[PDB]
Amino acid sequence: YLDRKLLTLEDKELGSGNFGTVKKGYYQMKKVVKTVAVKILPALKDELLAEANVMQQLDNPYIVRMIGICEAESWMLVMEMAELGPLNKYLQQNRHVKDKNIIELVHQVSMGMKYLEESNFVHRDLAARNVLLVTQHYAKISDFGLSKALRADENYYKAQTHGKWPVKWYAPECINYYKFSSKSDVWSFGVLMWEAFSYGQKPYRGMKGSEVTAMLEKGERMGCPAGCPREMYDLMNLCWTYDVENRPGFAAVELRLRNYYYDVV
Ligand SMILES: CN(C)c1ccc(-c2cc3nccnc3c(NC[C@H]3CCCNC3)n2)cn1
Numbered sequence: 001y002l003d004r005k006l007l008t009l010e011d012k013e014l015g016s017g018n019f020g021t022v023k024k025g026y027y028q029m030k031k032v033v034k035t036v037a038v039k040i041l042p043a044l045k046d047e048l049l050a051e052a053n054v055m056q057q058l059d060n061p062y063i064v065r066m067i068g069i070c071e072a073e074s075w076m077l078v079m080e081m082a083e084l085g086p087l088n089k090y091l092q093q094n095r096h097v098k099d100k101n102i103i104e105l106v107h108q109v110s111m112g113m114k115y116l117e118e119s120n121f122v123h124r125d126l127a128a129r130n131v132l133l134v135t136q137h138y139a140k141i142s143d144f145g146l147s148k149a150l151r152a153d154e155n156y157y158k159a160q161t162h163g164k165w166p167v168k169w170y171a172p173e174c175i176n177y178y179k180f181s182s183k184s185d186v187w188s189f190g191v192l193m194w195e196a197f198s199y200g201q202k203p204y205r206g207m208k209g210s211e212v213t214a215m216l217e218k219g220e221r222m223g224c225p226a227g228c229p230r231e232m233y234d235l236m237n238l239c240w241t242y243d244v245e246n247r248p249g250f251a252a253v254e255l256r257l258r259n260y261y262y263d264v265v
Pocket of ligand 1: 084
């Protein structure tokens, strides 16, 4: 547990939700300050501690690192700040990022997801808004509030209650059977790639999640973004394989992105 007296919070929020807010701050560690992002809040306490419990178990260059929890005026989860922020907003404001640079970033996300898959955690909210840029050439996955540690004997998490879900990033098996696996995250990764090569445009613009579900049941998918490399559009379509068993895992997806990235230059 962190000492609230060593944490200073800035006023401007990096994000918000029903839980509360995410704000920038500075945390005095031993001899220096660390720039941090802090999630600030009966059930929510448990969820935040669960979220922290997930981040505590993860250690990978492409996942946001948790500093710790701090109980003060409210419950806080202190994380290392990825100062460039969400990938979708960054590309919206920086339309001249090169396709090669986007490949590098999404490949980095796939390395982090490959690690998550190996560790047997499902993210359940993979999306461009939850890819944070440390630099224009270094991305980290964030926002583990919906993440679950899979049981040693199962390869999916079965949701009891359908809450407010990010339907546009979810695979059909999630929507129809409440079943969440690493392959479900692979589907989300495809949507994420689409967002990335579309410079942070929203997926399925103007459609209700229910209309997205119906479109996908018809075998229809989002089109190729302007200027998106063919091989990357092809990878998206592979990620959007309806049948979970035929859809690739992150091991395969990362390898494909690695080979393509290394082949550019
Ligand atoms: C627009 N700008 C310049 C910035 C910059 C940084 C962040 C930021 C940096 C984080 N770093 C580490 C951990 N969390 C973080 C965070 N969290 C918010 C959330 C909200 C909801 C979606 N995902 C992200 N935001 C947000 N905006």
